């Protein structure tokens, strides 16, 4: 389940090397690229040192089990550097900015923005037309299914570097000031600020 | 123009496949790598499956319009994982650390450091010899061109996980305490701290 | 050790590595020793320094029909950590410099950033987008919350780094300032800025953090 996927560019007398079905070998007679588990590929490189004379190994993760979300057909905008796990629901015309991180089970509603370097923890739920500020953290609640995650209702603005703690609901149309730590449910149409966040105005 | 670029490693009887001008195909008879739009390349893979035996598709962005900054000739240091949009000015001898993010229109002065996981929003301006702390956020003001962005003057230290709000100027030589939220202009050569940030020293 | 870190950093030359996919009449091109060329007659890829490869592309323009240049860093001297043999879990997007110790069964989450000299103990979790500064030390069975920042120090070598002792929980978006020790079993509330040592088995909160329990 945990994997250490590598891509390996190779060159040499490749016709002399046979590759197992466990690895995807894209090669011609002298040069090629190999895709597979490092444990499998390492053995191949070692046992064929005579014919594979040079190689470059690329690797981006170690003992990782959860794949990344396939972005190619999503009806929304995902910028370079955003890391999104599989099993995340991205609503129509949402925007996921550079270097944001979104964990499994998260939901991002239609038209919502997750700004740069923001973090959505497991199952965090963001409604429609929300703005989750840069560096803001929505706590995760990976399991059980019955455990209330962070829920941000529609039309909410969450300030930069905010933290919303596990199981907290931010009510519709509310505003959370930058830097706040939200420890309790926020009533709809109110502005909260501080650590712990307190209501400072009714909208 | 929103794009969905892909890089596709491919193999098969590749001479039998004709690639359009829209696709850059670096291939030989047996194997190759294709660069282009997903819409374009998906069509090619499906229609030529008779000749394509296997492939691997890589993709890092979806419906993305703004390209990344070409770093190759910049007289500065940019570390792996830093994400910098095009139309950003990076001063001589600046340093951009791993996992920082710098949005369009930002300006970083000579000798300044943007630390790990810091965020410079749209049009945010940083002077010379500044240090923007890890995780600090300089709010963005993307438009209109007449809206004042965040302006950090020279010789400033911004603490880790600070937020400087839209349109605020942090004056020359000031220090902002870690975790502060700067909600109004900071006078030159003062220390501010707290949320909201208040003058201390 | 700290002296070794400083010496390593300065023995490393600044690099601008590229990967360049090329095609054309490549048999007419002689690639220099300084470049790794994985090529066939028709097409291939080149690994090397931009300054070296740019020269090649120019001087052989008549033989190179097209190319794509990839680059992810500029004037960068410290390489990334080889993850392939580490007995831990490191997720995509995590950026870890060489000369970092990752303890058995640790977890480094997506988009975390770990500077040179850092030490992460066994079974500890560094959560999403957290930052470990130079020489920052995290004990065993710790949890460093998402977005939390542990201060760094590289120079001088004698300077005290941030030390997180065992069994600690650091809340999300917390900042621990340089030289601070967070005591064994302590809990730091989300959003706190820790400005002085935290006694073991206490709870601290606020900015500046103060003992609450
Ligand atoms: Ca290797
Ligand atoms: Ca990243
Ligand atoms: Ca989580
Ligand atoms: Ca912005």
- Residues paired with residue B11 on neighbouring β-strands, in sequence order: B31, B54
Spacing, Cα B36 to ligand 3 middle (Å): 34
d(CA C170, CA C4): 29
d(CA A193, CA B163): 14
Strand-strand pairing, A24-27 and A31-37: antiparallel
In chain B, residues with a C-beta closer than 8 Å to the C-beta of C16 are: 71-72
Residue with tokens 């999104």: A84
Preceding amide of C156 cis, omega within 30: yes
* Interchain pair B135, C147: CB under 8 A: yes
Q: Which of B167, B189, B166 is nearest to B176 (CA)?
A: B189
Q: Kindly list the structural domains of chain A, giving each domain's residue range(s) and its CATH number in brackets, ordered by start.
A: 1-66 (3.30.70.250), 67-203 (2.160.10.10)
Resolution limit in angstroms? 1.7
Burial of B24 (0-12, 13-18, 19+ CB in 10 A): middle
| Residues A83 and A102 sit within 8 Å (Cβ to Cβ) | yes
Chain B: nearest CA to C7, how far in angstroms?
Answer: 19
The dihedral sign for the CA sequence B173, B175, B180, B184 = negative
Q: Over chain A, what HEC string results?
A: CCECEEEEEEEECHHHCCCCCCCEEEECCCEEEEEEEHHHHHHHHHHCCCCEEEEEEEECCECECCCECCCCCCCCEECCCCEEECCCEECCCCEECCCCEECCCCEECCCCEECCCCEECCCCEECCCCEECCCCEECCCCCCCCCCCCEECCCCEECCCCEECCCCEECCCCEECCCCEECCCECCCEEEEECCEEEEEEC
Spacing, Cα A52 to ligand 2 middle (Å): 33
In chain C, residues with a C-beta closer than 8 Å to the C-beta of B28 are: 40-43
User: Nearest-CA residue of chain A relative to C90?
Assistant: A62
In chain A, residues with a C-beta closer than 8 Å to the C-beta of C188 are: none
- Residues paired with residue A102 on neighbouring β-strands, in sequence order: A84, A120
* Interchain pair C68, B28: CB under 8 A: no
- Chain C within 8 Å of A39 (Cβ-Cβ)? no
Q: Which residues of A110-120 are buried (b: 16+ CB within 10 A; e: fewer)?
A: bbbbbbbbbbb
Backbone angles phi, psi at A86, to 5 degrees: -60, 160
| Residues A191 and A171 sit within 8 Å (Cβ to Cβ) | no
- Chain B within 8 Å of C129 (Cβ-Cβ)? yes
Q: Which helix (H) or strand (E) holds C17?
A: strand C17-24
Chain B: nearest CA to A115, how far in angstroms?
Answer: 10
Q: Which of C93, C52, A180, C25 is nearest to B80 (CA)?
A: C93
d(CA C74, CA B75): 9
Q: How far from each other are the two terminal CA atoms of chain C, in whole angstroms? A: 36
Residue A197 CB neighbours (<10 A): 25
| Residues C181 and A173 sit within 8 Å (Cβ to Cβ) | no
Chain A: nearest CA to B201, how far in angstroms?
Answer: 22
Tokens encoding A101: 């991180």
Preceding amide of A196 cis, omega within 30: yes
Secondary structure (DSSP) of C35-62:
SEEEE-SSEEEEEEEHHHHHHHHHHTTT
Q: Which of C59, C71, A164 is nearest to B72 (CA)?
A: C71
- Chain B within 8 Å of C55 (Cβ-Cβ)? no
Strand order in the sheet with C149-150: C95-96, C113-114, C131-132, C149-150, C175-176, C193-194
Distance of CA C74 to the CA centre of its chain: 15
| Residues C23 and C66 sit within 8 Å (Cβ to Cβ) | yes
Q: Describe chain C by its helix, strand, coil percentages, rounded to 5.
A: 10, 35, 55
Tokens encoding A203: 């909208």
Q: Shortest CB distance from C95 goes to which of B35, B81, B159?
A: B81
């Amino acid at each position: 389940e945990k994997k250490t996927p590598v891509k390996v560019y190779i060159k040499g007398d490749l016709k002399e090397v046979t590759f197992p079905e466990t690895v995807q070998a894209f090669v011609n007679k002298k040069s090629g690229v190999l895709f597979g588990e490092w444990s499998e590929i390492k053995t191949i490189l070692d046992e064929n040192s005579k014919y594979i004379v040079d190689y470059v190994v690329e690797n981006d993760r170690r003992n990782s089990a959860i794949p990344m979300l396939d972005l190619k057909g999503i009806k929304a905008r995902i910028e370079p550097g955003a890391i999104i796990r599989d099993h995340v629901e991205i609503g129509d015309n949402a925007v996921i900015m550079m270097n944001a991180t979104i964990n499994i089970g998260a939901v991002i509603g239609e038209g919502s923005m997750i700004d740069m370097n923001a973090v959505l923890g497991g199952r965090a739920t963001v409604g429609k037309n929300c703005h989750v500020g840069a560096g803001a953290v929505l706590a995760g609640v990976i399991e059980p299914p019955s455990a209330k995650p962070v829920i941000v209702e529609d039309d909410v603005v969450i300030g930069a570097n905010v933290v919303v703690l596990e199981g907290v609901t931010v009510g519709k149309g509310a505003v959370v000031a930058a830097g706040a730590v939200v420890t309790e449910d926020v009533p709809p149409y109110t502005v909260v600020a501080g650590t712990p966040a307190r209501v400072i105005k009714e909208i």
